[PDB]
From Swiss-Prot:
PANTHER family: CRAL-TRIO DOMAIN-CONTAINING PROTEIN YKL091C-RELATED
Residue ranges of every copy of the CRAL-TRIO domain listed in the record: 98-271
Short name of one Pfam family: CRAL_TRIO
Lineage: Eukaryota, Fungi, Dikarya, Ascomycota, Saccharomycotina
Note, other: Present with 2870 molecules/cell in log phase SD medium.
Protein name per the record: CRAL-TRIO domain-containing protein YKL091C
InterPro entries given in the database record: CRAL-TRIO_dom, CRAL-TRIO_dom_sf, CRAL/TRIO_N_dom, CRAL/TRIO_N_dom_sf, PI/PC_transfer
Domain of life of the native organism: Eukaryota
Molecular function terms, GO-annotated: phosphatidylcholine binding; phosphatidylinositol binding; phosphatidylinositol transfer activity
Length: 307
């Protein structure tokens, strides 16, 4: 299996309940959880990493974890998450074209890793113009992309990042740049935020590592109060709204050489004229860390910048 080609044990300095750092009870809870699922005839996604994410998400309450896992499996099948990557490749050209149209307006890109080896993910929202957004894509379409990225994250990014780190990597280090957004637009996209939060928390438990919100406008705290209601306690604990000295905070978590210059680091693209919103740079692009899973497809087609 592919799980045999990359570390399945987390760093010994990781949080409680993570692969390889279990207490005696958590270990037994894990064996019991798997035993129940096998008995119900489930066969995929029964590895320690996957099951421990569901267990952690429900504080090791086995009954709650089974319910969550069972619901997740139903959703994946009804939604088509299980063949989403396959379906994308069958219609790649068309997909890429649509994806390229939104890149400049809504930059979303991975760029290296944080100090623990987690994929470093960036999103900029100040350039978003809703009126134009609605002419290029739909809300459901955006959710589909989010689901597709979660699957890409799990099959290509996790293995490569884990091999480079020498330990299992299960989460990402996210930076949300709100520079230039208008609070008014923020309120209008609450339903989308809610849908994103629901998919993430219900079907992709424990995928959040560190989540930084920077350049938020005055009064953002008021708007975040509209969001907290549908975020569970653990999720909230991973979100950090940074102030004016945000660069210093990012530097505590991210190597200076991996952090882009505009965020306080020294990282630049091989070709200074290339755009970050067309880039996808990281271990999963390094032949030395790519395994049997093969290399990740290019999200922006021929425009994808990998260095
Ligand atoms: C046709 C258009 C119709 C609707 C279009 C909406 C346009 C977009 C508007 C909102 C965009 C920003 C929404 C925040 C999404 C944050 C990114 C995210 O996925 O958060 C999820 C988690 O969801 C959360 O927990 C939410 C965290 C707090 C979100 C609070 C943001 C506040 C919103 C204010 C911004 C409004 C900007 C104005 C828009 C014009 C994934 O986290 P991760 O670290 O695991 O992600 C990285 C790894 N992958 C990529 C695999 C997930």
């Amino acid at each position: 299996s592919i799980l045999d080609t990359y570390p399945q044990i987390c760093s010994p300095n990781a949080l409680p309940g993570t692969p390889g750092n279990l207490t005696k009870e958590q270990e037994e809870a894990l064996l019991q959880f798997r035993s129940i699922l096998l008995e119900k005839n489930y066969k995929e996604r029964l590895d320690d990493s996957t099951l421990l994410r569901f267990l952690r998400a429900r504080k090791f309450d086995i009954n709650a974890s089974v319910e969550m896992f069972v619901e997740t499996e139903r959703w994946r099948e009804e939604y088509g998450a299980n063949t989403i990557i396959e379906d994308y490749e069958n219609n790649k050209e068309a997909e890429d074209k649509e994806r390229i149209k939104l890149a400049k307006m809504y930059p979303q890109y991975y760029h290296h890793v944080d100090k623990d080896g987690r994929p470093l993910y960036f999103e900029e929202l100040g350039g978003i113009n809703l009126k134009k957004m609605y002419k290029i894509t739909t809300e459901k379409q955006m959710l589909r992309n989010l689901v597709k990225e979660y699957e890409l994250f799990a099959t290509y990014r996790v293995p490569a990042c884990s091999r480079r780190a020498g330990y299992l990597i299960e989460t990402s280090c996210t930076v949300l740049d709100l520079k230039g957004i208008s609070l008014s637009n923020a309120y209008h996209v609450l339903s989308y935020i809610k849908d994103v939060a629901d998919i993430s928390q219900n079907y992709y438990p424990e995928r959040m590592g560190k989540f930084y919100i920077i350049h938020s406008p005055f009064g953002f705290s008021t708007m975040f109060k509209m969001v907290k209601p549908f975020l569970d306690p653990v999720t909230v604990s991973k979100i950090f709204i940074l102030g004016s000295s945000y660069k210093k905070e990012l530097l505590k978590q991210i190597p200076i050489e991996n952090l882009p210059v505009k965020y306080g680091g020294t990282s630049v693209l091989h070709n200074p004229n290339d755009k970050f919103y067309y880039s996808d740079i990281g271990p999963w692009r390094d032949p030395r860390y790519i395994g049997p899973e093969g290399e990740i497809p290019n999200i922006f087609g021929k425009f994808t910048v990998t260095s």
